[PDB]
Amino acid sequence: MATMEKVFAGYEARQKVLEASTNPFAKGVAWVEGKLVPVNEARIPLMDQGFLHSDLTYDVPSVWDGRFFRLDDHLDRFELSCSKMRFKMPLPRQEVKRILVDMVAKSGIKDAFVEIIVTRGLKGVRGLKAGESLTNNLYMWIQPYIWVMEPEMQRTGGSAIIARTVKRTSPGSMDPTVKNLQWGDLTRGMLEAQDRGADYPFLTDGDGNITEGSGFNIVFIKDGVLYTPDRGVLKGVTRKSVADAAKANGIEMRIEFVPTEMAYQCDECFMCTTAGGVMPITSMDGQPIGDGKVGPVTKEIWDGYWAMHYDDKYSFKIDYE
Amino acid sequence: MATMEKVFAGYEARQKVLEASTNPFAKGVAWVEGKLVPVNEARIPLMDQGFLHSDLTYDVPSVWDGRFFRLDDHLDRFELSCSKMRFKMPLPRQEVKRILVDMVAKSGIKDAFVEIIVTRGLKGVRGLKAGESLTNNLYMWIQPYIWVMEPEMQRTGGSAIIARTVKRTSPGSMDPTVKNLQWGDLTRGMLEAQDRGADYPFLTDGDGNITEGSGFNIVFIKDGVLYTPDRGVLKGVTRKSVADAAKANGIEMRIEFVPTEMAYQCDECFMCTTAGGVMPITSMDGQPIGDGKVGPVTKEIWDGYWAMHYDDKYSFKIDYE
Numbered sequence A, B: 001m002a003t004m005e006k007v008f009a010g011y012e013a014r015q016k017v018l019e020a021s022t023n024p025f026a027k028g029v030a031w032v033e034g035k036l037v038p039v040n041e042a043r044i045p046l047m048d049q050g051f052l053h054s055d056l057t058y059d060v061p062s063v064w065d066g067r068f069f070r071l072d073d074h075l076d077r078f079e080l081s082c083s084k085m086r087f088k089m090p091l092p093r094q095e096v097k098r099i100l101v102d103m104v105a106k107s108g109i110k111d112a113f114v115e116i117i118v119t120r121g122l123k124g125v126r127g128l129k130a131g132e133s134l135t136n137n138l139y140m141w142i143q144p145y146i147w148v149m150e151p152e153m154q155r156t157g158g159s160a161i162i163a164r165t166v167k168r169t170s171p172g173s174m175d176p177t178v179k180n181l182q183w184g185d186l187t188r189g190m191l192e193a194q195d196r197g198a199d200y201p202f203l204t205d206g207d208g209n210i211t212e213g214s215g216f217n218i219v220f221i222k223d224g225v226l227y228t229p230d231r232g233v234l235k236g237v238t239r240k241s242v243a244d245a246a247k248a249n250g251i252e253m254r255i256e257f258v259p260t261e262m263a264y265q266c267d268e269c270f271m272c273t274t275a276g277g278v279m280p281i282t283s284m285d286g287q288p289i290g291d292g293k294v295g296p297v298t299k300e301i302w303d304g305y306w307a308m309h310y311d312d313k314y315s316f317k318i319d320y321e
Ligand SMILES: *Cc1c(COP(=O)(O)O)cnc(C)c1O
Pocket: A060, A179, A180, A212, A213, A214, A215, A216, A217, A233, A234, A235, A236, A237, A238, A239, A272, A273, A274, A275
């Protein structure tokens, strides 16, 4: 569309400038043990329990056109995730925010993926002896904005399959509201999608309901109403932003059980996530969804989501000096 | 017992020698990108997908009294795990074996924990573009033998709870026969055990059956017969060695559905794993199991397991030169 072309033209112009930069942080920068290092040189201890037992939680805010998007909502969710895991995040919130902004500013990156991780640290829960306390670790980094669905694919939509060989990890085993890197099911789904000649996997709960996919929530549009699963999934900030844009435009959105049959009967579909935004799906199990083009309500939400990036209710300008 | 005292006296004597060594590898040694580094200096790339999405498998053989125990069974299982994950292990099997043995020899460690990991590498499955191929990474290390249950606790047994707040990750989400580091459920179980004043968590499948715990298989003894769960668990090498020792002594062992009620009706119980061996459990949900002492069949298996460490069918001597 018109607004797709706007957003992407601006991104492509900024990318041209960034690709030409000699700033050693232009390809990204990490914070490790209080030091900034270029991201592709960053290393972590082999003995970190975030590696050894994936005992960590994380969050991913973003920067668009030099504006941090919903950073506070990310930090709020991350505090909740840290508490549910019994971590103590090693630096106060305000210091974390200041460091993230300085990192961005230092790098010159205008459109950024940001990741924050807290891990159990160098000593595990399994080994704990009487009297001992654990010190948790923090890792953060900025890189150029990652696209789960590239811009050119967002214009046409991508393809999906309903995964048949795996189901989403039950909340009784791992709470899917705690953003985590334990992607065993998600990775199985990706491999299935590859095998089946589809771009993206949608996992069910194994009981006839749609959940989420490999790093994204799932939204269906049917008879002018948005539907998205309630249980079994991460409470996305992108999905919240979709609800905000729906409300702003008078579009109903239901957060509820979504049966698998919706994937075959929907009028439109899109995935949503911070790394990419609103990502239309125009094929399902090898068949076009309607006419196979990106639908009107999807584009209305798409435009609304990107407009929020310039609204001071949901974003703030970074001073790059 | 008599054989407990034998094994542990030998270990304590060897540990005294190791604690006195100035070898820079005596605290452990890792192999990273073809170089040996002291384990507590070893680092991995932040961008490794083994960290970023826990997209890895691993295995843990061991060395006892300068003898590698069942190394081939570990390498066989690890090949299977690598294939199920669609990894190509970066070095041939024979080279991996030679490197592991050289590492041990170089370190001087007689009683060792060994870990081998293969990860998806520096590029993820999610990001894959048309035409691209992935190169997987290898990490290996040796350290002094880790005890999931310390020697002194093996003499008395430890305590367990049947976990009520978590269930083992279903094979429909993550195959538990592929040894993995995605411990979300296991870590929840450990925290529950701590909360409940018990040493170890036993997880159910959420359908009335016992599975495994936080890095160990679970064995019950009832009316002179060993019972251990079939589905939902890793096919331990320790559990296989238990079956071997049972057979050698005319003790029946059933690998089958184990209802939760067995935890409350058993005559004896033990956990088993490479990092510790045979680990008696003498309390369950806060109540002693029988007289609360380590039982006779448990000790018969315990002695048998350690005898196997000196049998050339199941072990080989390392030349330390
Ligand atoms: C990150 C993520 C999402 C999206 O959450 P956002 O807050 O919108 O970025 C959805 N599901 C999974 C599994 C994720 O990892």
